[PDB]
mmCIF file of C-alpha atoms (C1' of nucleotides) in Angstrom:
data_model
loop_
_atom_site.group_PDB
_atom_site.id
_atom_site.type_symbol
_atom_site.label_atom_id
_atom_site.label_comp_id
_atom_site.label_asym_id
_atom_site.label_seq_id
_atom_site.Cartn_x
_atom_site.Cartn_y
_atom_site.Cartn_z
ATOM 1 C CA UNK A 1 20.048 -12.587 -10.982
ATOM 2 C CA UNK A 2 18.525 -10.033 -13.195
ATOM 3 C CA UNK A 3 16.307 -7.066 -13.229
ATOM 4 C CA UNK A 4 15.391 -3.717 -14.646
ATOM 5 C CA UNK A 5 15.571 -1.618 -11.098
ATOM 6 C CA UNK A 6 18.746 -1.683 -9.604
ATOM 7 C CA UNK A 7 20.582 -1.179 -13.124
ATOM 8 C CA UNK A 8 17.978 1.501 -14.300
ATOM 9 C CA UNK A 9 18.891 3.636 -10.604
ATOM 10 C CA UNK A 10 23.052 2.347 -10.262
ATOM 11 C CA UNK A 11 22.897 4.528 -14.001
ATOM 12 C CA UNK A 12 21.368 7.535 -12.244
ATOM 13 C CA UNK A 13 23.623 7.065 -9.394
ATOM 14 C CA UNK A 14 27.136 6.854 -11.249
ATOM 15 C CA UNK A 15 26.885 9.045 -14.322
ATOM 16 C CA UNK A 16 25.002 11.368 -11.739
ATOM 17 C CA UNK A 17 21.854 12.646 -13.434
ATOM 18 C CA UNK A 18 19.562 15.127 -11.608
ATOM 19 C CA UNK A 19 16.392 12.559 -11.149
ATOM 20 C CA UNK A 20 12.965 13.769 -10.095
ATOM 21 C CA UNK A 21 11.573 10.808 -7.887
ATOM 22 C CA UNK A 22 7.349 11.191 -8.072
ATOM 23 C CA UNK A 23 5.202 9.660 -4.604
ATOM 24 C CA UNK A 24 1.708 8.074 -4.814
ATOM 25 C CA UNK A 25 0.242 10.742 -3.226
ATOM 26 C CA UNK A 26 1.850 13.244 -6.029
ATOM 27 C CA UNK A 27 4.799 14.727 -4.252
ATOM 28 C CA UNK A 28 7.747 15.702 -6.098
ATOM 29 C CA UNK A 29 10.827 14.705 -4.418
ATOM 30 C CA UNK A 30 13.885 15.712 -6.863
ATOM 31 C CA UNK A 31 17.235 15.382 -6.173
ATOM 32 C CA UNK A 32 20.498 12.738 -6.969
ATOM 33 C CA UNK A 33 20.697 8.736 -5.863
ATOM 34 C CA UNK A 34 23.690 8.542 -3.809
ATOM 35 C CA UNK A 35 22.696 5.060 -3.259
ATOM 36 C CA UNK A 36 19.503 2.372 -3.053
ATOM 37 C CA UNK A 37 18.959 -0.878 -1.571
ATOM 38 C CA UNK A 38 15.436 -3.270 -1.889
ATOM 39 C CA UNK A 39 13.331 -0.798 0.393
ATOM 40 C CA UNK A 40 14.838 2.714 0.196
ATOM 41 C CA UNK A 41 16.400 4.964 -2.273
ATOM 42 C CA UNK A 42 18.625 8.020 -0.578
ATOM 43 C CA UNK A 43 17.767 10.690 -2.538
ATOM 44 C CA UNK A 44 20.314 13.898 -2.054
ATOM 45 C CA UNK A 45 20.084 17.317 -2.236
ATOM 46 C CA UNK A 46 20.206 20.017 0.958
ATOM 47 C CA UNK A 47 20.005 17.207 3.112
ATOM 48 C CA UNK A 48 20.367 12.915 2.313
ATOM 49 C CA UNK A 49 17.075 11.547 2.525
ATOM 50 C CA UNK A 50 15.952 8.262 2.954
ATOM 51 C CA UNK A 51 12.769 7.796 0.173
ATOM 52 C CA UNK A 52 10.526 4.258 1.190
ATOM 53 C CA UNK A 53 10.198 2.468 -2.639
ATOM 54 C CA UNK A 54 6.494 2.078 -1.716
ATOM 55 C CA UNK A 55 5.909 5.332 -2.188
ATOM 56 C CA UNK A 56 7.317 6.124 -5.448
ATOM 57 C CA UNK A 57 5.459 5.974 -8.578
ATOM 58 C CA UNK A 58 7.706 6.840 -11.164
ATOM 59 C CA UNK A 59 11.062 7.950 -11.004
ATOM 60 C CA UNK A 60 11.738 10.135 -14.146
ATOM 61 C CA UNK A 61 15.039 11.322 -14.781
ATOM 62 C CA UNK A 62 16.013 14.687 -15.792
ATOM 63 C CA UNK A 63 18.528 13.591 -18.823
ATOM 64 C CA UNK A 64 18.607 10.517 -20.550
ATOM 65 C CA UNK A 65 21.410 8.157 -19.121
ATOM 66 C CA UNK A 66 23.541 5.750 -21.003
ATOM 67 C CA UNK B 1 23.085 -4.656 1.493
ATOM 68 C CA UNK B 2 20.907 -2.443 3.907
ATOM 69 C CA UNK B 3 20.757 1.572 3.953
ATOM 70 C CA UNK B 4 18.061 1.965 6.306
ATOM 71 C CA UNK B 5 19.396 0.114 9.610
ATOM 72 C CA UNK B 6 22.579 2.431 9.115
ATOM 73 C CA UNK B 7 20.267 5.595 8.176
ATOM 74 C CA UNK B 8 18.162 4.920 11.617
ATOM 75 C CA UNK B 9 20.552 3.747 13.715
ATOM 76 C CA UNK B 10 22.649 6.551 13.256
ATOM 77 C CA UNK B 11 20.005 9.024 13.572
ATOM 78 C CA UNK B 12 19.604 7.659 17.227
ATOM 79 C CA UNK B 13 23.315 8.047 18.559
ATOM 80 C CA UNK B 14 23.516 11.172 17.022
ATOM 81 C CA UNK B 15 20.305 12.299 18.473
ATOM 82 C CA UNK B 16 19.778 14.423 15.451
ATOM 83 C CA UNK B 17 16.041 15.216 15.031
ATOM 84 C CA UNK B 18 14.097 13.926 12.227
ATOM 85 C CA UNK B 19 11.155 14.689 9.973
ATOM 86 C CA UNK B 20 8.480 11.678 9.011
ATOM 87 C CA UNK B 21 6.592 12.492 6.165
ATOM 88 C CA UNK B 22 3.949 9.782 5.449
ATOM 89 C CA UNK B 23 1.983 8.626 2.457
ATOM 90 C CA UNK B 24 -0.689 11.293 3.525
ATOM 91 C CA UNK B 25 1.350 14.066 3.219
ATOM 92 C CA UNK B 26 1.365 14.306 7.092
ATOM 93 C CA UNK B 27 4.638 15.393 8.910
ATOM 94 C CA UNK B 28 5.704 13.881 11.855
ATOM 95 C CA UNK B 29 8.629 15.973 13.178
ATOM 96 C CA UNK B 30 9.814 14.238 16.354
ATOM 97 C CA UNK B 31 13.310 12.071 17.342
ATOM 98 C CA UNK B 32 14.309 8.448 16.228
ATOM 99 C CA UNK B 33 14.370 6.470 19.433
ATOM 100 C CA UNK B 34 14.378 2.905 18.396
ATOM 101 C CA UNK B 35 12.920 0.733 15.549
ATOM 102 C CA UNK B 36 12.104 -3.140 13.834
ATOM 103 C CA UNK B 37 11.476 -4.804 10.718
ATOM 104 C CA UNK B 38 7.948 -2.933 10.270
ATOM 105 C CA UNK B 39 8.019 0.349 12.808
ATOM 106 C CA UNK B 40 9.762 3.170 14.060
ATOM 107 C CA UNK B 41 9.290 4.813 17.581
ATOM 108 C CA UNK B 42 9.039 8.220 16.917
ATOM 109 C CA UNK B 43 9.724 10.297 20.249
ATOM 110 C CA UNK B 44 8.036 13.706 21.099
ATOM 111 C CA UNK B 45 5.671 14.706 23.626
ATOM 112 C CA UNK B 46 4.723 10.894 23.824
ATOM 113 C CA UNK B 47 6.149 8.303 21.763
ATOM 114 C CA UNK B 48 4.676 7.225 18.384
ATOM 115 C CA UNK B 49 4.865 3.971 17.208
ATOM 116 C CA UNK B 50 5.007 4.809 13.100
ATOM 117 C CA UNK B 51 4.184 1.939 10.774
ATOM 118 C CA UNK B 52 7.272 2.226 7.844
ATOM 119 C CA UNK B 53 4.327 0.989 5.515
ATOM 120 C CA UNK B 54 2.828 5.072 6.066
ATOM 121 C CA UNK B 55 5.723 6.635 5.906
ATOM 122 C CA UNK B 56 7.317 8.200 2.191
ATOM 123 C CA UNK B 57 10.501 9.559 3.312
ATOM 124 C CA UNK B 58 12.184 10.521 5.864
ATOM 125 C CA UNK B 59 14.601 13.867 6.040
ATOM 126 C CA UNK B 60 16.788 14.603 9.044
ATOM 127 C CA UNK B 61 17.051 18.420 10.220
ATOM 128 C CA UNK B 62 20.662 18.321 9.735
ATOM 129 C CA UNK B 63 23.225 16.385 8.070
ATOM 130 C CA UNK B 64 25.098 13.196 10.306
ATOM 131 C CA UNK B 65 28.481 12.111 10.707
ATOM 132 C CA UNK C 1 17.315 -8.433 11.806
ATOM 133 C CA UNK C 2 16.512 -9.965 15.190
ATOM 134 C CA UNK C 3 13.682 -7.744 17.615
ATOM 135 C CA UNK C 4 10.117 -7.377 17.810
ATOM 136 C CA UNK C 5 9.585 -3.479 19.172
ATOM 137 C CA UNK C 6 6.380 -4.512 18.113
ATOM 138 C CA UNK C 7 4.324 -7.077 20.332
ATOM 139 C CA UNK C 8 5.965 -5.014 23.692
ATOM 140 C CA UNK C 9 4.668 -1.528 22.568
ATOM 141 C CA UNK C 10 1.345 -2.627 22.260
ATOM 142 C CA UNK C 11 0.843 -4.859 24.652
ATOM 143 C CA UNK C 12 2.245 -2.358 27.137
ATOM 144 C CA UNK C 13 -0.772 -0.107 26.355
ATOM 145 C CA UNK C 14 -2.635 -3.093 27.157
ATOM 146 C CA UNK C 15 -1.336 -4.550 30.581
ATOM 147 C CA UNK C 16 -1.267 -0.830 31.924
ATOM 148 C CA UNK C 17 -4.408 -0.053 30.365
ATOM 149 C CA UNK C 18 -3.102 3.031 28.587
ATOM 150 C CA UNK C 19 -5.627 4.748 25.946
ATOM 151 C CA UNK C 20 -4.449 4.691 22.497
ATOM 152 C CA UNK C 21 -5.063 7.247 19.713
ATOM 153 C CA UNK C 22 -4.573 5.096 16.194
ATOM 154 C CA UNK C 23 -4.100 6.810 12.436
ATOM 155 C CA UNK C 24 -5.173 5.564 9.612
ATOM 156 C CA UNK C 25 -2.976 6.040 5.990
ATOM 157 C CA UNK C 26 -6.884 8.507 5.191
ATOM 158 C CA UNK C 27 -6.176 10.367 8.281
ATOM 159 C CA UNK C 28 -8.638 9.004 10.581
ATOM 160 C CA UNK C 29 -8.535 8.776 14.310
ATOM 161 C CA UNK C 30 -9.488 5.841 16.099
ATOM 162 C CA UNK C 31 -9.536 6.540 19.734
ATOM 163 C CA UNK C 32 -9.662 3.281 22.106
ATOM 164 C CA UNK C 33 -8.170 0.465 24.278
ATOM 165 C CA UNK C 34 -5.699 -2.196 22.626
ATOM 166 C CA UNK C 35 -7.569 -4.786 23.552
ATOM 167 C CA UNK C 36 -5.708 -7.572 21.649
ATOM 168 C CA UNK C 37 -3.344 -7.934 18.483
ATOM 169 C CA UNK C 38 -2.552 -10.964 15.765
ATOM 170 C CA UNK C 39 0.466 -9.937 13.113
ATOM 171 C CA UNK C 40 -2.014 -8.297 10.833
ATOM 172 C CA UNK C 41 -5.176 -6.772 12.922
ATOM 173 C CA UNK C 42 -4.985 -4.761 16.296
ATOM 174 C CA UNK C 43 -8.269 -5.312 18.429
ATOM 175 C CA UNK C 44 -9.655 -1.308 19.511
ATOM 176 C CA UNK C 45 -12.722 -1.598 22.040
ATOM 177 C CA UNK C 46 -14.259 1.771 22.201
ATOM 178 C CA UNK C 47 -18.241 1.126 22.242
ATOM 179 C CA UNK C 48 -18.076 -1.450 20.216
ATOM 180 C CA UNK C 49 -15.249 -4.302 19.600
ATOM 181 C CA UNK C 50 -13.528 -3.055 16.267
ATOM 182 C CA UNK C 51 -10.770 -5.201 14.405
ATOM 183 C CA UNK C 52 -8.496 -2.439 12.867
ATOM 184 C CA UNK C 53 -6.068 -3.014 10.084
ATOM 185 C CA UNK C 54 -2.485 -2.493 10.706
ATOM 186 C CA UNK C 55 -2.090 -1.979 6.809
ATOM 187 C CA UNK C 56 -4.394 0.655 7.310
ATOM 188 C CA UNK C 57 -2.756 2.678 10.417
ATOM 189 C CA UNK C 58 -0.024 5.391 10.375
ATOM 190 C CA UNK C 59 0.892 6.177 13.529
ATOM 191 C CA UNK C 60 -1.075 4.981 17.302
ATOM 192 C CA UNK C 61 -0.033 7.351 19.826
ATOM 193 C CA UNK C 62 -0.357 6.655 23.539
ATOM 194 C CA UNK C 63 -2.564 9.228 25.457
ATOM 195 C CA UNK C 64 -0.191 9.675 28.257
ATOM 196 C CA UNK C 65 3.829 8.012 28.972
ATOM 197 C CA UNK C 66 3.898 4.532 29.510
ATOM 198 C CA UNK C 67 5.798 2.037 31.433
ATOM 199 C CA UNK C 68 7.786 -0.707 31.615
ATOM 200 C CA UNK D 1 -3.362 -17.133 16.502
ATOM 201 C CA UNK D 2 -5.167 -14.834 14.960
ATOM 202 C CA UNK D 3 -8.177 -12.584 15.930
ATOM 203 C CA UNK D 4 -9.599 -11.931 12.037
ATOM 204 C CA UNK D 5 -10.350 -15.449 11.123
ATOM 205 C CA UNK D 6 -12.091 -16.036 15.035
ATOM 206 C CA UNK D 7 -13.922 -12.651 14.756
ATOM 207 C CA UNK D 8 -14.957 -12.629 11.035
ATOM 208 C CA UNK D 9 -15.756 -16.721 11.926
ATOM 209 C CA UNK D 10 -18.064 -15.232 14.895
ATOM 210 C CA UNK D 11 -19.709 -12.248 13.089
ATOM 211 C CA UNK D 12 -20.883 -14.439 10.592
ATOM 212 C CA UNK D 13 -21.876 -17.305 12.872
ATOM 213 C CA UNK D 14 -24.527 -15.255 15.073
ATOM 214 C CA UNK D 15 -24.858 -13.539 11.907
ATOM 215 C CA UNK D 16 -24.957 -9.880 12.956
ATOM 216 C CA UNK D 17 -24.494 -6.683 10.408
ATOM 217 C CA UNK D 18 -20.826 -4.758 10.496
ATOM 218 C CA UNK D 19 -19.644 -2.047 8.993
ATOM 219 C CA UNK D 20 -16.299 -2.673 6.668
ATOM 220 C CA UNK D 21 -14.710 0.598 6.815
ATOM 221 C CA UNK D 22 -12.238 1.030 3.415
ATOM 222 C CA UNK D 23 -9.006 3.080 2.982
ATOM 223 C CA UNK D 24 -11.208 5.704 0.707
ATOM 224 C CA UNK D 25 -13.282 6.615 3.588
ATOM 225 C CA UNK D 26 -15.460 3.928 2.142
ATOM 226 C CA UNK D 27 -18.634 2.427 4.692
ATOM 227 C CA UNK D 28 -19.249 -1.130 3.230
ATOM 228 C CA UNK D 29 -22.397 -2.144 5.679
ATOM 229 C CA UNK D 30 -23.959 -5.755 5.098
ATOM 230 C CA UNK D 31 -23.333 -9.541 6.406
ATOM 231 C CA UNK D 32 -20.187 -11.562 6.301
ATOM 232 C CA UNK D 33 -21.162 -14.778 4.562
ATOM 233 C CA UNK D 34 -17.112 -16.035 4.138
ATOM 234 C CA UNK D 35 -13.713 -15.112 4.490
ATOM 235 C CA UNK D 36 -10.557 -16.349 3.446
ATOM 236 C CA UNK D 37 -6.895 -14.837 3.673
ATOM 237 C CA UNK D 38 -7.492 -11.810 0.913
ATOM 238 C CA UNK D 39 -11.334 -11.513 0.461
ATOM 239 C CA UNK D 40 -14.457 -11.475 2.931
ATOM 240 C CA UNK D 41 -17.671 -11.824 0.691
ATOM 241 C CA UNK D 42 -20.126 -8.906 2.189
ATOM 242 C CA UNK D 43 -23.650 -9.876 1.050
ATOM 243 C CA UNK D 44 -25.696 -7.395 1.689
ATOM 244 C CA UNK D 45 -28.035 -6.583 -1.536
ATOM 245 C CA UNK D 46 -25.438 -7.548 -4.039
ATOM 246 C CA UNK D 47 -22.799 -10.293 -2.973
ATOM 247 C CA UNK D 48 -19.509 -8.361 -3.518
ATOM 248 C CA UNK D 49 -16.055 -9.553 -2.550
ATOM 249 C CA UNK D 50 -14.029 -6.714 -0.539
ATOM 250 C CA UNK D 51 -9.840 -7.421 -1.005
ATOM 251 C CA UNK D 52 -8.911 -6.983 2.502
ATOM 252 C CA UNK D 53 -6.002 -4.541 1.447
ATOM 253 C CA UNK D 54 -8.437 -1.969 1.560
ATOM 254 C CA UNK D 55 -10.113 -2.593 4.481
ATOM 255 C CA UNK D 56 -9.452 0.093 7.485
ATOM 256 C CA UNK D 57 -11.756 -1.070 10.624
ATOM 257 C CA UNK D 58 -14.089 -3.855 10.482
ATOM 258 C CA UNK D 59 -16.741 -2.905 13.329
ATOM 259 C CA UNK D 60 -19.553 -5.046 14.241
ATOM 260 C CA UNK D 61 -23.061 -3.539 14.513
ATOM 261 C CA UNK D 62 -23.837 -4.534 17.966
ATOM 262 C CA UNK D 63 -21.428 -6.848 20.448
ATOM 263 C CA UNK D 64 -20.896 -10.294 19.740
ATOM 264 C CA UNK D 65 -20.716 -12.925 22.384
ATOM 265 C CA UNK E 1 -8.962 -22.955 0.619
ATOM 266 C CA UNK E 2 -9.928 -20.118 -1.068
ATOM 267 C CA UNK E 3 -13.727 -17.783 -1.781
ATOM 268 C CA UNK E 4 -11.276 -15.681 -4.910
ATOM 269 C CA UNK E 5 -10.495 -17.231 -7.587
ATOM 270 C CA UNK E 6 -13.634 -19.559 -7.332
ATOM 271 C CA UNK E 7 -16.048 -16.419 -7.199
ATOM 272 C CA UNK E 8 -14.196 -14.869 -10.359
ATOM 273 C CA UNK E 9 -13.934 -18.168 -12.392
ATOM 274 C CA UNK E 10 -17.687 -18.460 -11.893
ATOM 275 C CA UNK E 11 -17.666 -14.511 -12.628
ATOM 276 C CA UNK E 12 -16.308 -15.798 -16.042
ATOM 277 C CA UNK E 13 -18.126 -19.261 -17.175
ATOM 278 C CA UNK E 14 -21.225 -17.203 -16.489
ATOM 279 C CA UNK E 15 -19.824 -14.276 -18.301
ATOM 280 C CA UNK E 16 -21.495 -11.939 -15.672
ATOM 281 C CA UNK E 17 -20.700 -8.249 -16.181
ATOM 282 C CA UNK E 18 -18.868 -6.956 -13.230
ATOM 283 C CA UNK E 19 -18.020 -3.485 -11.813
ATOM 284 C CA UNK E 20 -14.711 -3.194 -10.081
ATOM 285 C CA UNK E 21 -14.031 -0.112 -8.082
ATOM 286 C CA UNK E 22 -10.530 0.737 -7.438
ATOM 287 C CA UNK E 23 -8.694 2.122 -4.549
ATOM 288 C CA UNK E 24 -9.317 5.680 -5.694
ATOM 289 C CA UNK E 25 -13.088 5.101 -5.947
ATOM 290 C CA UNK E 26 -12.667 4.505 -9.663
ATOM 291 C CA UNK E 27 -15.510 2.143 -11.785
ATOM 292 C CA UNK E 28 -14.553 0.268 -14.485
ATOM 293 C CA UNK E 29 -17.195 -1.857 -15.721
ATOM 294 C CA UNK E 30 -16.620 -4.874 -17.962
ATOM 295 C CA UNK E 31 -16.710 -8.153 -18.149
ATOM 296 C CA UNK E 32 -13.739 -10.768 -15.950
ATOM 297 C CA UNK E 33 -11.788 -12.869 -18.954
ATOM 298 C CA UNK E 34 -8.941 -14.145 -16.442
ATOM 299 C CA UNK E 35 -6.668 -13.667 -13.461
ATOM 300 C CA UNK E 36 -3.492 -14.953 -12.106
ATOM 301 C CA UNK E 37 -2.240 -13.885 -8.770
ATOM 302 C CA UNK E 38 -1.695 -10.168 -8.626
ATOM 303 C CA UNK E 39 -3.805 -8.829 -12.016
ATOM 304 C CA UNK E 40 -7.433 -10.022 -13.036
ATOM 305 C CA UNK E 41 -8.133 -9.121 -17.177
ATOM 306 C CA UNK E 42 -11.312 -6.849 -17.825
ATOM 307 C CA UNK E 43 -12.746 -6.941 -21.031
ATOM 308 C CA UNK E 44 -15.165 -4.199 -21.722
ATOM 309 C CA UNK E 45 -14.156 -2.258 -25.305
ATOM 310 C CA UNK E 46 -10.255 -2.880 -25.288
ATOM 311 C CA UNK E 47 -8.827 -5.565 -22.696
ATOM 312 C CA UNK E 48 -7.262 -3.572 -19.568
ATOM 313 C CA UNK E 49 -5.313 -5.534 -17.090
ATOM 314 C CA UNK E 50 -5.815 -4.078 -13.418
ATOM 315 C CA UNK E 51 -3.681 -4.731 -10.565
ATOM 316 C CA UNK E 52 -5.542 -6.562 -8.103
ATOM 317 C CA UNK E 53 -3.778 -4.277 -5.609
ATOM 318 C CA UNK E 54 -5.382 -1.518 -6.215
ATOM 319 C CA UNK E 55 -9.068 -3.237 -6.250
ATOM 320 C CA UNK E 56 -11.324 -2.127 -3.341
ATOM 321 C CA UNK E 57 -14.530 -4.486 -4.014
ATOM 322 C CA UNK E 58 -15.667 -6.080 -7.150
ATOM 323 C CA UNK E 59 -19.279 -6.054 -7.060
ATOM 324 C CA UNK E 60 -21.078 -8.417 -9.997
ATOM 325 C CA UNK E 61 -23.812 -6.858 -12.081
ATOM 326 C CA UNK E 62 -26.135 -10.087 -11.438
ATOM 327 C CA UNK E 63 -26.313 -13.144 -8.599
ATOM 328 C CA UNK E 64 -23.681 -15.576 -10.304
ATOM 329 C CA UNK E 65 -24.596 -19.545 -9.123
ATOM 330 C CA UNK F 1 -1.687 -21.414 -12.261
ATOM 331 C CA UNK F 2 0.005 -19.610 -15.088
ATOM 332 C CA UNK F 3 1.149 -15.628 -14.602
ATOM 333 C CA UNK F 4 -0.359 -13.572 -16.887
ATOM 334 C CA UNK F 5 0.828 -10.105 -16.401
ATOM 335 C CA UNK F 6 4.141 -10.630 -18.406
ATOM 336 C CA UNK F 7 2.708 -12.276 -21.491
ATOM 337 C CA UNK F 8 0.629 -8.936 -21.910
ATOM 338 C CA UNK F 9 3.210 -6.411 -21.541
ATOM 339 C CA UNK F 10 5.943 -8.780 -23.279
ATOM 340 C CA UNK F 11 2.764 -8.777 -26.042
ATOM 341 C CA UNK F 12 2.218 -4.975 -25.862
ATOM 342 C CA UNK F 13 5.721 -3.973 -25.960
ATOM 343 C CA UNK F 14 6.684 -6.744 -29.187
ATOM 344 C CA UNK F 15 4.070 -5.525 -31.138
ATOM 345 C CA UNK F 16 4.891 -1.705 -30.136
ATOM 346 C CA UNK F 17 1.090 -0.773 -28.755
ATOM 347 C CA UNK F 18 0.662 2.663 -27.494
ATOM 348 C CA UNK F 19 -0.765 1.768 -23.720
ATOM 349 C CA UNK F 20 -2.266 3.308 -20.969
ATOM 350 C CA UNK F 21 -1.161 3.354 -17.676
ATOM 351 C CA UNK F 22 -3.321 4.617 -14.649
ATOM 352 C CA UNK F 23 -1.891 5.360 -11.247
ATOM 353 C CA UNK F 24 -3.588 4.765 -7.473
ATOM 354 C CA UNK F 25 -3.001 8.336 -7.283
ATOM 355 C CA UNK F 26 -6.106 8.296 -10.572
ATOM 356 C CA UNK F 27 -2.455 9.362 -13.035
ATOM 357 C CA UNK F 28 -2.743 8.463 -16.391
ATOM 358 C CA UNK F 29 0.745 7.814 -17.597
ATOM 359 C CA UNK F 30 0.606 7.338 -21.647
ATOM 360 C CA UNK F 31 3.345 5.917 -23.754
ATOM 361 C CA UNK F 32 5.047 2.903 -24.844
ATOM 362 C CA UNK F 33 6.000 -0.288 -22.688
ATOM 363 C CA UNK F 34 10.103 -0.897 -23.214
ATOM 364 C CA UNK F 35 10.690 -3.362 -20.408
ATOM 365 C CA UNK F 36 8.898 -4.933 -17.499
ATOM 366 C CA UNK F 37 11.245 -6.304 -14.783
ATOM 367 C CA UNK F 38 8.656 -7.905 -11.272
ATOM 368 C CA UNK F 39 8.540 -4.466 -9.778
ATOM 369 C CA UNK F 40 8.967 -2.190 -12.636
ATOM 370 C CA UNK F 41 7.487 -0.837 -15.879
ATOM 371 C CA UNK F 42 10.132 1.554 -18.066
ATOM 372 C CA UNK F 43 7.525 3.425 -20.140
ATOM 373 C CA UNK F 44 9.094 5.395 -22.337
ATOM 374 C CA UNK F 45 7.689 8.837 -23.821
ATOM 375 C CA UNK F 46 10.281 11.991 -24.081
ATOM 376 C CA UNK F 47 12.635 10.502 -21.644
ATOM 377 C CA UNK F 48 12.353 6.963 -20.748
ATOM 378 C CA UNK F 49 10.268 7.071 -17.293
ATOM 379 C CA UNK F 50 10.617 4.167 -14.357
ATOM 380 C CA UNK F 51 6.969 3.363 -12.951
ATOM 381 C CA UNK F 52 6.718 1.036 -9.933
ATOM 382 C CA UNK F 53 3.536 -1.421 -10.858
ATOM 383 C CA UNK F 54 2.654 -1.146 -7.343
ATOM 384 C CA UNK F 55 1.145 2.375 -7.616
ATOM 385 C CA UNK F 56 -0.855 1.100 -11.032
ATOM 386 C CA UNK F 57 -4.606 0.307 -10.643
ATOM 387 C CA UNK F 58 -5.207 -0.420 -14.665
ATOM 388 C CA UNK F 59 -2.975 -0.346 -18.108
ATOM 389 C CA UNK F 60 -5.913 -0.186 -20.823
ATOM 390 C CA UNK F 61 -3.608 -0.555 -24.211
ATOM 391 C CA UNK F 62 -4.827 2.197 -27.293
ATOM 392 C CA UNK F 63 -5.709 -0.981 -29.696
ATOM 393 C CA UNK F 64 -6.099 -4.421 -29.344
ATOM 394 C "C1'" A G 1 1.327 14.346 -10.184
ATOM 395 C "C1'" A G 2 0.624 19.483 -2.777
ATOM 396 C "C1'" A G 3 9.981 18.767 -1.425
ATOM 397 C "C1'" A G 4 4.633 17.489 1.237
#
RNA sequence: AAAA
């Protein structure tokens, strides 16, 4: 078991960088990943939302992380 | 393993109303009454059967205990 | 991880004959009566028999309640 | 049991025109000379292959039996 | 059986031009060198590889028997 | 028969090819291919960017 | 790249 996606986000998620998640239909949805699983990413800020991975084009995040 | 049967599920016992926002940028502000592998039923002035392959995310109108 | 919400809602609009509104991911409307559905296509006979997507459709919202 | 391969498999055996509606808002109007699980080849003046992934509504130009 | 692959590999012994529009109603215009299962390789001043998935119809520049 | 989609971005990433990469939303994302895992392409420009190859309709590299 |  390996991959680039789950390590790439678990590094957003635990040293806590501000991430700007983009949509396919170019919405900005920016917040923090409290957590992810193979369909959604909860993406927090105001209020936990639950972001569908097939709408996300790039996920760009706001510092570089470790 | 999943974050989206817990997400749902507990936005139906707690009743808490929900936004939809789909791929379109179209917002479908109703209540989560049920769902499956490939919808949710959306419930407002008539329930909506929403395909989860349309909708982007998903943002409750409050937080949920 | 073990329910089909699926194959009842829409046949429901069928055996009770209940007009359907259907959305499509452009933002279409495609007004009709679920006239039969597969796992990828749902049937919609309006004036002429169309085989809609369901890759293609947001939402389908019945016209009035429904029963069971 | 499914109703694409029957009513494709019908619209080009009494060989009628259709429209195939795309996800752009696209009107793809010719003759369905095959099929199979991702393409249906439309020839109309050109012979073009449509992926079916961005196919909305297939709607025949007149009833079929 | 399949009316894909066939249609490109013949799309490609040929060495038809081809247009391929895109989801978005985009045209690129080259020439098919090869394809897998999810990308197909246009050729047309710098090799591109386009996703498959995002290909609407790929209409060929000439009959290709 | 044989995949063909990691060969060219292991190939455009060893050789260190500026690349293209256009969006379904008609984005052009430019800058350098550092990884490719099935569902994911970590272009890399200022900051090192995560794109999702299913919203990419064509990756056209900037040479051969 | 319309937190829509």
């Amino acid at each position: 078991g390996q991959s680039l996606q789950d390590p790439f986000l678990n590094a957003l998620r635990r040293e806590r960088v501000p991430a700007s998640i983009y949509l396919v239909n170019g919405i900005k949805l920016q917040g923090q990943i409290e957590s992810f699983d193979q369909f959604v990413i909860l993406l927090k800020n105001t209020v936990s939302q639950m972001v569908y991975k097939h709408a996300i084009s790039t996920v760009v995040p706001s510092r570089p992380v470790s």
